[PDB]
């Protein structure tokens, strides 16, 4: 009897596929569904991903942005049915997988010690310029 499999089973019917791939260092916009009493509206939230911790269906990730003079971090599950869509905006190169240190840090300091990953951005044009091979017939 595989209990490990039995869990991977159950979750399967909550798992999204549609979500892009990304790494810490990426800057990223997440449309999130919230309730304002009655209404259910879509509030965005973009910033540098600082930490993706993986565990399958339970995998989650953290984004950090400053807002109105003070920084927020928010944590989203990577399969919440309350995420409408997520957006790549910019891609960086971290040397490590957990980027906390940029908390106790400046904005012009973070600018240089997080370098735009030219490589992985090119593979995205590769994706997208070849993604227009549906509008071709």
């Amino acid at each position: 009897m595989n209990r490990g499999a039995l869990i991977k089973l159950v979750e399967s019917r909550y798992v999204r596929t549609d979500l892009p791939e990304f790494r810490p260092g990426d800057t990223v916009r997440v449309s999130y569904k919230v309730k304002e009493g009655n209404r259910t509206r879509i509030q965005d939230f973009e910033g540098i991903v600082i930490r993706i911790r993986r565990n399958g269906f339970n995998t989650t990730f953290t984004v950090r942005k400053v807002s109105y003079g003070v920084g927020v971090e928010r944590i989203f599950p990577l399969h919440s049915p309350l995420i409408q869509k997520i957006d790549i905006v910019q891609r960086g190169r971290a040397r490590r997988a957990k980027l906390y240190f940029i908390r106790n840090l400046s904005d012009r300091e973070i600018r240089r010690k997080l370098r735009a990953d030219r490589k992985r951005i090119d593979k995205d044009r590769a994706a997208e310029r070849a993604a227009k091979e549906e509008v071709q017939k």
Binding site: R3, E11, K33, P81
Partner: peptide, 18 residues
């Protein structure tokens, strides 16, 4: 007891145990 994770219901998350 095979082990627990969590799921989703009416846009609320619930810890279960399978």
């Amino acid at each position: 007891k095979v082990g627990m994770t969590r799921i989703f219901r009416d846009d609320r998350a619930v810890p279960v145990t399978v």
